[PDB]
Design a binder for this molecule. Sequence first.
Ligand SMILES: Nc1cc(=O)[nH]c(=O)n1[C@@H]1O[C@H](COP(=O)(O)O)[C@@H](O)[C@H]1O
Ligand SMILES: Nc1cc(=O)[nH]c(=O)n1[C@@H]1O[C@H](COP(=O)(O)O)[C@@H](O)[C@H]1O
Lengths: 322, 328
Amino acid sequence: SMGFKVKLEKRRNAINTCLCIGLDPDEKDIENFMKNEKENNYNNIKKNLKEKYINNVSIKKDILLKAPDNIIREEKSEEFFYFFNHFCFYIINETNKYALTFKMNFAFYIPYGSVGIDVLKNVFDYLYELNIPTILDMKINDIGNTVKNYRKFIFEYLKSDSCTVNIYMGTNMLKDICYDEEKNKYYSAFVLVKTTNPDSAIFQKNLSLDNKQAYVIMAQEALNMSSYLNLEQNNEFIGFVVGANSYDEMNYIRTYFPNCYILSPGIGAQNGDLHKTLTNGYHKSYEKILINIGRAITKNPYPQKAAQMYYDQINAILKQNM
Amino acid sequence: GLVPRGSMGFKVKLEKRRNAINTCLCIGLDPDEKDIENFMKNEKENNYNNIKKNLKEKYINNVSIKKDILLKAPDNIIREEKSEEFFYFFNHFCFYIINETNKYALTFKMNFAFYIPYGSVGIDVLKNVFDYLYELNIPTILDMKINDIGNTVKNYRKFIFEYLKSDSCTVNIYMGTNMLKDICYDEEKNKYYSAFVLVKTTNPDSAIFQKNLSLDNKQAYVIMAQEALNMSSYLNLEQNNEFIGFVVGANSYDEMNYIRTYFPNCYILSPGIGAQNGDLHKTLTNGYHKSYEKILINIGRAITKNPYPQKAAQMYYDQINAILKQNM
Ligand SMILES: Nc1cc(=O)[nH]c(=O)n1[C@@H]1O[C@H](COP(=O)(O)O)[C@@H](O)[C@H]1O
Ligand SMILES: Nc1cc(=O)[nH]c(=O)n1[C@@H]1O[C@H](COP(=O)(O)O)[C@@H](O)[C@H]1O
């Protein structure tokens, strides 16, 4: 067990990027994949079937290994499962060489009931086999007794490396998310600090304590809690979600918490500025500034090339900042 | 003037149930791994008397997922459906609690966290639990404290309100109030839904942001409550028989009083009685409304971890009702 701090550093050394690929497939993405595959003689599924680690996923592997034409006539109930899982495998196979991390937003995997949670588990199994660091974006929050269920789901069942957390209820929830006292285990989390929605100022900026805006108070309390838990000693961390349209806050956070880990969504579909974001959030250890791109890759019909462009542009910008 | 189950807004469903059973008890259904294991053990030791009682209830035939398994004889499951054993006993535990306690419940609140830690299997259970409650016509809340950007949260709306057919859910609006437009309203179908936003919570350090943060001498919890109601008005929820309400912990007596004083007709959901030792008399006094569906008192573990959940629920029902009577 490396610990997520170490997993990130080592993969950064191998692939020299901070691109975080977001995998948030929606119903139209899955439908479109099925339709295109049905028309292009299942070219991408056939490619997926040749990859080594498809043989290691834990749920309904023998369904996933069946030929598509046979799924449709013999395992029709499993059609949606099969195409949803294969869409995810396809995106991962096409793009993983460019990704420091993958982030999966739980919301996209739940709305069909159990079936998408089987897909989600298989996606985490597949990434684990590929040794790619993972983030589950679920924005979890509850009282201690309740949130230990999320710890189990995220860190034991999915074996995620990290997750996102909303600490507005308080910053003691992290004791039951990032630490398992009975097992002496430690896990990493990114807490929400400044988000990308257009009205994010209403609580994050307009509330304050002793003339520091709420987002700074929350960031500091999160770090206070990380220190309490001794995460960084155990190769784990609490970091910050700072939107990639929030340049002032990104600048402020990187200046006043010089060595914090930042996860930054909002470039591509939400129109954030890549150059400004990466420059204001820059750190020499650039795994500390994860640039998440979801729909601009997954809704691109040429996702390998989409991911490659972001990888190449991030690397150009990192070079300028170095 | 009569309408079938499912064909009225939550506001009206709550009022109608409150006039039927005359309480504000909300029963929390948060089964943990120990609960499921202990139910399985006890049923195995007693020839499955509670499971056999669940199996005679009419509406068990109306749930969506794996009925072929749920309706099997329990010894059949153990000896020839080994891989379905956990699903079966988990689902039957939930059915058992609902069967034993529903006559006392104004609502049931299911916390999503308890249904996810085993992967997909608990989501099948959760879907059957919501289908069963829908058939019984008992008001539901999915406690999930959802929050995300608009495009992402529509997925939670679909899960909660289409897939589970929940009446309501809990929401954390720290990201912003805009997300309520994509939770409490579906612009494609023109459907409206109800939610309780987090206002003041029961965790011991809840003051760290909810009270410490402020805008011009109003504390965060007050500003969040007001913005949630501003959004409810904008969306016209109450005109469509839905609402945005507030989660205010049972142990937060001063904040409960403030909220009921400054928002006299708001809907409050109050967890923290029983396992978390909140003061029921103070909570109900401070949150009282003559339409007491506007002050839901959630009790989970103190009922579901009792070996006699029907009697534990009756006792809380009677205790609540005695306090309500003092207030009336
Ligand atoms: N967690 C987030 C906090 C945030 O402020 N903005 C945001 O978009 N997210 C999530 O990041 C991803 C943005 O993806 P995309 O806009 O690149 O598709 C989605 O999973 C969002 O729900
Ligand atoms: N949503 C909540 C907000 C809160 O402040 N406290 C709280 O306990 N809850 C939930 O209510 C229930 C409390 O149940 P119990 O303490 O009665 O078992 C659990 O589902 C908690 O996660």
